């Protein structure tokens, strides 16, 4: 107790926390590793994701050497705030949280050699830009970039503790994604030049693939069945003018109901996605089926249909006969081309 | 070497009075400012605001902080900013702004041998932009950021863009979802009052909205419904069930488009360009259904006491008038 208390009071003597270790002598090297406890939800509307990490940093400060029975110390939050620590920040971080329930989720340990190990539990809400042109068959590499805010490459350099791939670890139950599947992460480091100097950046990209099953049942299948339904009217007799007129408009209204609901699932981008083109093409087929009947009805001479017992009766429309093959085939051609293109991407 | 630096830093801050500006009894302190826009996001028409994250750098010379014998630029800890004088700059249109504090507060203090102080800040600001949306979605917006000193006039402090028109960087790297940054402009001016002139820096962007989203989601579905209402003109007059059902369903479909676009589009409670087009298409499908009632009444009401002529006249006027409506609409707004 007395020996332990003696070291703590003596360590801070003659210590200036305003100066990085090795200032004017060498480059402060910080070893970093990340344990991802939970890769949180990804918001496509805000193009951001949440990640919960244990951020570990290790550097050497020769000013904090000590000799005693113990080999590793342990500093409280008050004493840790009196010691220089790296000014690490997240370049793409939007609004991050440092947890302090019930006490500050931080820990600073000092070895007799002078090595400081700094761990903190963080929730980082980073921004993940997305190219939504292939939605809902898109895949994104969400980045997590961090580094020193004030100290340039000639002052503070960051390195991964272990091999870079092994320096970022994701918990096996960490994935908290609903619409994505985390395929893996690539760990790398780079350099950025700004108006203040050149800085070392540590990057980690999390590769996410969107699940397509939800949009097939909710959007693709109802749209395909609506288009089939519009082409079904081609097999009705041409004398059923009210029946085929109700068929055409109500399928257009059905497509409008499906088109509005499908659009709410995606943020307001200003380009046509893969699902946007599918809805538009399905909208055209349903629209053209009603236009086809208007042409068929225009050449219907007699207003009475054929009776079972049998006068002259209308023959089956040649436009109807051709549309019973052309319309189903063109939609089948579009589906094969559409699904072959985007699924291969 | 590090011990010599420590002696210098303590010497600089010994006797330093934060409450007094550099050259307190002399010329105004000139503060040079640069902005590195990390991103612009959440350009909201409902809230009339936009959010941007930037690296806000301020440069000024303080002879009280000049040091000699060290050929290095002293980058001190971020907490040393509380022991130095920094300008009292604020943003006029800022509604809610913060400095990021993970892992530490995102600020920097870098000292230079001649006494120049670099004060950096990573700030996310939600600034206010009053948007004229009468041409929405074919509208160009103008978002500004006004920087001013709270309690200093041009006698005490001065503002300028460090680097000229290259002071603000990162604008070309910004990709907005529904907007395109046509240009950004830097303005340096002194707001002259009776009490005195107050320095101000203005950073303004010109955002042009992209119409690709609205063409495929708002305009095209309304056009197709309007054309579908013209099918009734090629159906025989005696087909009351076919023509009325087609006409009244297109009225219902237009209402469904309008009511759902009301929720999907931002809640802007006044007349816009999109509202005029949707109401224009609603009238056209209203007249088409009303056209048959005139045709039906002529044959059956005034019959016992030319319906084909009315339909033939309708087959030409309706496509022509709608095309005329489109030509006047697009020329006035585009």
């Amino acid at each position, epitope marked *: 107790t007395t020996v332990f208390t003696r070291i703590l009071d003596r360590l801070l003597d003659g210590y200036d926390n305003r100066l990085r270790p090795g200032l004017g002598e060498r480059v402060t090297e910080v070893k970093t590793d990340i344990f991802v406890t939970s890769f949180g939800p990804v918001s496509d509307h805000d193009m951001e994701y949440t990640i919960d990490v244990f951020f570990r940093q290790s550097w050497k400060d020769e000013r904090l050497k000590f000799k005693g029975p113990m080999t590793v110390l342990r500093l409280n939050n008050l004493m840790a705030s009196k010691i220089w620590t790296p000014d690490t920040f997240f370049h793409n971080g939007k609004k991050s949280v440092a947890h302090n329930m019930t006490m500050p989720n931080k820990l600073l340990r000092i070895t007799e050699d002078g090595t400081l190990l700094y761990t903190m539990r963080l929730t980082v809400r980073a921004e993940c830009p997305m190219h939504l042109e292939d939605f809902p068959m898109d895949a994104h*590499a969400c980045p997590l970039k961090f580094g020193s805010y004030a100290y340039t490459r000639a002052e503070v350099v960051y390195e991964w503790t272990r091999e870079p791939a092994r320096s970022v670890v994701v918990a096996e139950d960490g994935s908290r994604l609903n619409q994505y599947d985390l395929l893996g992460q690539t760990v790398d480091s780079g350099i950025v030049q700004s108006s203040t100097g050149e800085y070392v950046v540590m990057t980690t990209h999390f590769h996410l693939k969107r699940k397509i099953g939800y949009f097939v049942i909710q959007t693709y299948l109802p749209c395909i069945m609506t288009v089939i339904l519009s082409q079904v009217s081609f097999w009705l007799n041409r004398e059923s003018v009210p029946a085929r007129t109700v068929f055409g408009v109500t399928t257009v209204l059905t497509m409008t109901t499906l088109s509005i609901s499908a659009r709410n699932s995606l943020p307001k981008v200003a380009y046509a996605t893969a699902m946007d083109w599918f809805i538009a093409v399905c909208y055209a087929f349903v629209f053209s089926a009603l236009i086809e009947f208007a042409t068929v009805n225009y050449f219907t001479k007699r207003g009475y249909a054929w009776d079972g017992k049998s006068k002259t009766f209308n023959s089956v429309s040649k436009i109807d006969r051709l549309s019973r093959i052309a319309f189903p085939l063109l939609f089948g051609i579009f589906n094969l081309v559409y699904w072959a293109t985007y699924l291969n991407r | 070497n590090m011990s010599f630096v420590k002696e210098t830093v303590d010497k600089l801050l010994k006797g330093y009075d934060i409450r007094l500006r550099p050259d307190f009894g002399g010329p105004p302190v000139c503060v040079g400012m640069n902005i590195d826009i990390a991103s612009i996001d959440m350009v909201s028409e409902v809230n009339m605001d936009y959010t941007l994250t930037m690296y806000f750098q301020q440069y000024w010379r303080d002879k009280r902080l000049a040091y000699s014998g060290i050929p290095l630029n002293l980058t001190l800890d971020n907490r040393v900013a509380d022991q130095l004088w920094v300008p009292d700059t604020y943003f006029l249109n800022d509604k809610k702004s913060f400095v990021h504090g993970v892992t530490v507060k995102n600020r920097m203090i870098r000292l230079h041998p001649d006494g120049t102080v670099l004060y950096g800040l990573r700030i996310t600001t939600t600034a206010a932009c009053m948007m004229d949306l009468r041409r929405y979605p074919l509208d160009e917006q103008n978002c500004t950021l006004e920087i001013e000193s709270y309690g200093y006039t041009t006698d005490d402090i001065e503002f300028y863009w460090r680097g000229g028109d290259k002071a603000v960087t990162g604008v*070309e*790297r910004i990709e907005l979802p529904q907007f395109s940054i046509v240009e950004h402009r830097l303005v340096s001016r002194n707001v002259v009052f009776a009490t005195g002139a107050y320095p101000r820096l203005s950073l303004s962007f010109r955002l042009k909205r992209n119409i690709g989203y609205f063409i495929l989601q708002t305009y095209m579905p309304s056009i197709l419904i309007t054309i579908l209402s013209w099918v009734s003109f090629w159906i025989n007059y005696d087909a009351s069930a076919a023509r009325v059902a087609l006409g009244i369903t297109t009225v219902l479909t237009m209402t469904t488009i309008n009511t759902h676009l009301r929720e999907t589009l931002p809640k802007i409670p006044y007349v816009k360009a999109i509202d005029m087009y949707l109401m224009g298409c609603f009238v056209f499908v209203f007249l088409a259904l009303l056209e048959y009632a005139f045709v039906n009444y002529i044959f059956f009401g005034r019959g016992p006491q030319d319906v084909n002529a009315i339909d033939r006249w309708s087959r030409i006027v309706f496509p022509f008038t709608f095309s005329l409506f489109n030509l006047v609409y697009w020329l006035y707004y585009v």
Partner: nanobody
Amino acid sequence: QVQLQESGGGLVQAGGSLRVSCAASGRTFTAYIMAWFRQAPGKEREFLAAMDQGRIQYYGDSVRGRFTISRDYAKNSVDLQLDGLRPEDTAVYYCAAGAGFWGLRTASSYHYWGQGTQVTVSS
């Protein structure tokens, strides 16, 4: 059609410097990762440098400190400043652009490619 055209480069006396440029058209790559790849004759295709939307400059270990990559986001182009040229740099230099899925150093992660440019360091 999206076209990437590498411009500049060729034969150079040892110790010279070449700035290889790459103009892009048909799609703005401000949100894409533009990179430079090298393919020696018969060996492999090698990653050299990459610069993303955040101006982060990634370099391969074999060309780190010698080659400098820069991007002109206004002009939608990427440049590779070759310094300290050696005869081992004689290859075809490719300009790539992609989202960097599973990549940023893998050639398969880039969808847009240039025709290449033969840079010969003869001594």
